[PDB]
Amino acid sequence: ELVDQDIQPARYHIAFGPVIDGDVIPDDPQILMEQGEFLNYDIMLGVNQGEGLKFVENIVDSDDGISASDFDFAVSNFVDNLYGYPEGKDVLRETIKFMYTDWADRHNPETRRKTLLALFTDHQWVAPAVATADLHSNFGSPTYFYAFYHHCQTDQVPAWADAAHGDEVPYVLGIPMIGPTELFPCNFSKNDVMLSAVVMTYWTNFAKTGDPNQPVPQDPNRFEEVAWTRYSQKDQLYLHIGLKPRVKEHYRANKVNLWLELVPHLHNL
Amino acid sequence: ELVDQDIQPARYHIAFGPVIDGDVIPDDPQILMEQGEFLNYDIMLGVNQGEGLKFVENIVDSDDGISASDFDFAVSNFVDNLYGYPEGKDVLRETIKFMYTDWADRHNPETRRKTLLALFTDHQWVAPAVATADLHSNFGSPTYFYAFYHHCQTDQVPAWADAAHGDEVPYVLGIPMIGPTELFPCNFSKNDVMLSAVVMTYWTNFAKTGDPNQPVPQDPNRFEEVAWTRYSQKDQLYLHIGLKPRVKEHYRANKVNLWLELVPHLHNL
Amino acid sequence: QGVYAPAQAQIIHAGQACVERVYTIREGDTLVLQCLVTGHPRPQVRWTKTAGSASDKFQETSVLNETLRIEKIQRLQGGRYYCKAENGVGVPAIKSIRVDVQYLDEPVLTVHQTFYQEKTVFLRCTVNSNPPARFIWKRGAETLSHVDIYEPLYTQGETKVLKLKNLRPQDYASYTCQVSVRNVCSIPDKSITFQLTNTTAPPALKLSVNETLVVNPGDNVTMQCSLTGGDPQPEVLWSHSPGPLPPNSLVQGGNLTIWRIRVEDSGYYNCTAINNVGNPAKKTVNLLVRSMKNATFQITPDVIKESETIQLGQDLKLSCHVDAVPQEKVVYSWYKNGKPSDRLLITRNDPELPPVTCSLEIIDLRFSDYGTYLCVATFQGAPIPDLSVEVNISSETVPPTISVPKGQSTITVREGSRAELQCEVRGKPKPPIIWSRVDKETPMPSGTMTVETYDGKLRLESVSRDMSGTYKCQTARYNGFNIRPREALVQLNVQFPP
Ligand SMILES: *[C@@H]1O[C@H](CO)[C@@H](O[C@@H]2O[C@H](CO)[C@@H](O[C@@H]3O[C@H](CO)[C@@H](O)[C@H](O)[C@@H]3O)[C@H](O)[C@H]2NC(C)=O)[C@H](O)[C@H]1NC(C)=O
Ligand SMILES: *[C@@H]1O[C@H](CO)[C@@H](O)[C@H](O)[C@H]1NC(C)=O
Ligand SMILES: *[C@@H]1O[C@H](CO)[C@@H](O)[C@H](O)[C@H]1NC(C)=O
Ligand SMILES: *[C@@H]1O[C@H](CO)[C@@H](O)[C@H](O)[C@H]1NC(C)=O
Ligand SMILES: *[C@@H]1O[C@H](CO)[C@@H](O)[C@H](O)[C@H]1NC(C)=O
Ligand SMILES: *[C@@H]1O[C@H](CO)[C@@H](O)[C@H](O)[C@H]1NC(C)=O
Ligand SMILES: *[C@@H]1O[C@H](CO)[C@@H](O)[C@H](O)[C@H]1NC(C)=O
């Protein structure tokens, strides 16, 4: 009787879930993390290139593109739901549109789709993850960061979609090694098996020693000479997980800092 | 008696100069251009990589870097002088700082110097030039756009400086061909002579036919196979003038559009 | 010059106007500007206009008259006009004025629908107007923030949107966008209304043919495009690319019929539905008419031995090609004094040569190979006719050479009359000649860079002096030897009076 009830929460929010009770959860995670009120665990975290596929999938026209008006609408809905501020939502919406507009090739409805997808991805996954990594490393927690830029496209997802939310799971679980399953029907390639082995090696290495690089080496395997450096707020090194893996720095620094530093400022303190 | 008087104008503005009299100058150039109220001349225009050297040259510390506080001050002075709006200058200053902050390597005082220099360069030279080119081509004027990324460093300018305001003049005038002069004492290299010849070829070609590519070909000369395509608002092709010349698209599109589209919006219409 | 005085101009306002340096009038009214002038000798006056040649309000308008008169003015006739007055003494006098024609078209009202808690509709109101328009929304009563209103980016004041964040029952009503131009030039406001109901829905279409449709010439093809949803009832419309639909194709409305379809009718036919709700629905069908044209052969002597001639003990490729619409569906058959091939003579269907070209090679050429070869291109069970290309190989066959007959290298003609340029080619077979211009990169009488000719003659009906220059003639790489083309030049003088 309780489960079958229809309880709709605010958009982008939840009704029933974890709460700040002051016991299990002593305080707002934001406050606890900013003030370093947490123990120093070994941490590994990351995000996927195109988390927000479903965010735009429903507003895409028959041409796989998004109109300028639809773009404005999405942002408008986005601003109202997440930033329910009465005075100043106008400047916010316009600023957000500008940042996520590709001024080189600004008229392309398909590029518009990509950047809009990036907006939701950056806000809901990338920015929070970086904030967590920055605070954990800053307060002494050994941190490792990754970006997943690979996936296996089924005939059920658009051909233009990049790695979406959850697409890394099959690799982490080694599904490619036992071939397509009822739950994961994608026709995994040799490269999928190779990448799956790599992910599992990194994941279990972390579990065994707290270091993705120890004790099992990456044994053509493109990760043979790629050591996963620890993440720090100063260099912000992260592992680019794909068929052409390598260590990079400051993942989407510009867009991430927009949400973490400037937008909060526009709140008028 | 009239010349020796001390008449200081507003910062970044002039006291005595061209005025909108309704005769010689029928109206605000902005209005005339937006409404296409001008004849279709053949036009060639461009800007230099580091126009605004003098803008930051005076605020640089003994380490060739700019402090975060000095950066804030420069922007603060910049916002007040150009954007004398009473309500809203706060959000403006903060937005401008964010855009011209390199979030990858955000703590480097020298990178801070470069981006600050870019701010003044973009606002005073690049943005207005693009606006002119966009409107001229849009209204049918044959347009050619360039970016000057070369110069000859004298012992009087900082070693870190890029092509500054006026640095293209010696090349346009062929000074390198007759060696260092009293007015232009830089020890011109073979490359300076080569580039000077190229610029003069392009400039005079435009004068002869209205096409920088005709009738004299670029005759090792790295411009041999580089045809200068006409500028248009859709592709915004421009010639990158340097020792490694080539045609590019949408010069600093992101930063240019900030000044031309978003900032004006923040005025509250 | 004691009494001679420089020209002096002054603009005056007349005709119909409204309400400093600008002359604002309502569209459709009459403009009357007068330019009073002084100075000795009496200066002449011409009204002209200044506009970007390639955009918007542009007209070439040079009138010699102290009065500018534009009756029933229009949007485009607007702009900046200047009166110039000169008399020889001193600098000409110039005065500027901006004519600002004003108007207010009928507004357009469109609407769009849209976790999972609240349903949201966006009512977008757009209108073209000078000056910029003022928008007012109402649901019988005027609406304020009490829902949200605003102007989005990428709009210069021509657009306002009414956002209904939570769609409660009272909101299901008739919304009307009332747009005003401040009654300047005594122009009335205008309104448009829409009936927002919970049945309101964008258009939807269903097509009676597949994504891509292949057909033979002459066949009659009819395509039914029917609505499957939409409120208000959307309007269905057919369109064609490239070019227009007709002739021999009629639209009943929804039904599109093509009679006796020709090959040129191929392309995309798009059915679109619109009701000012959401994005318009569009179904697209690509109609491909079958055809085969321009069958061509190529003689390719031994390339690795660097030969340009048929020589015993060499490889000899005999290629074959035809232009077809279902290009992938063509099939070639190589006959040789009848129809045979494994040893020595082998088939190759796709070399570096043009697309889908069948070419057999003859290894170690031999007198026994001297014969008449035939290639037959055909469609699998298609009513269309087959095409063929015969190519006789013998001791006589020889790469070509080109020259200019006698002394017609330079041929002079008088402008207007007809001109005939001549090159003569020798070889077996003789390939066609391709004429091009060399002194400059310009097109030709045919409007393109090059022209095909078999007689080696280039005919010029109405010769123009512009054509005067140097011309190149060269052997084709098809219908003959696939060898470095042989070249020859001819001069063309187009004489004209002094
Ligand atoms: C019939 O079909 C043949 C092809 O089998 C056509 O010949 C082709 O003509 C085009 C343009 O006339 C040639 O394009 C060329 O491309 C090269 C690229 O290297 C360029 O250098 C040339 O200046 C030219 O643009 C193409 O090569 C040529 N193909 C062959 C095999 O010769 C012929 O035009 C067609 N004729 C008719 C009446 O349909
Ligand atoms: C000038 O134009 C007006 C009407 O446009 C006409 O009535 C008048 O005769 C013209 N006179 C001259 C000198 O052009
Ligand atoms: C919509 O409104 C109509 C009233 O005309 C009502 O009958 C119907 O139940 C409502 N709901 C839907 C889903 O149409
Ligand atoms: C096409 O239509 C014409 C009359 O419209 C008819 O006479 C002819 O037989 C039809 N041909 C085919 C192939 O349908
Ligand atoms: C029809 O649609 C195709 C793409 O589906 C497009 O390339 C073409 O321009 C369209 N034609 C018209 C007339 O809209
Ligand atoms: C389709 O329309 C044509 C004329 O446009 C008409 O002759 C034909 O009978 C119609 N057929 C159908 C099935 O609607
Ligand atoms: C080639 O040989 C055939 C064999 O019958 C003959 O008909 C034709 O006239 C010859 N000449 C050609 C094809 O130019």
Residue numbers in the entry:
A (entry chain A), B (entry chain A): 358 to 576, 584 to 633
C (entry chain B): 19 to 37, 45 to 139, 147 to 178, 184 to 377, 381 to 538
From the reporting publication:
MDGA proteins bind NLs and control their function and interaction with NRXs via unknown mechanisms. MDGA proteins are attached to the postsynaptic membrane via a C-terminal GPI anchor, and their large (∼900 amino acids) extracellular domain consists of six immunoglobulin-like domains (Ig1-6), a fibronectin type III-like (FnIII7) domain, and a memprin, A5, mu (MAM8) domain.
The hNL1ECTO-cMDGA1ECTO complex has a 2:2 stoichiometry and overall dimensions of ∼180 Å wide, ∼110 Å high, and ∼120 Å deep. Two MDGA1 monomers flank the NL1 dimer to form a 2-fold symmetric complex. Each MDGA1 molecule spans the NL1 dimer using two large, separate interaction sites located on both NL1 monomers (Sites I and II). The smaller Site I (859 Å2 BSA) is formed between residues from (1) MDGA1Ig1 β strands C, F, and G and loop CE and (2) NL1 loops Leu289-Gln307, Ile377-Asp385 (part of “loop L1”), Gln392-Tyr398, and Phe496-Pro499 and helices α2(4,5) and α4(6,7). The larger Site II (1,000 Å2 BSA) is formed between residues from MDGA1Ig2 β strands A, B, D, and E and NL1 α helices α2(7,8) and α3(7,8); (2) MDGA1Ig2 loop ABIg2 and NL1 loops Ala110-Pro132 (“Cys loop”) and Asp361-Asp385 (“loop L1”); and peripheral interactions contributed by MDGA1Ig3 to NL1 α helix α2(7,8) and loop Val417-Ser424. Furthermore, the LRE motif is present in the majority of mammalian AChEs, and besides in NL, it is also observed in the cholinesterase-like adhesion molecules neurotactin and glutactin.
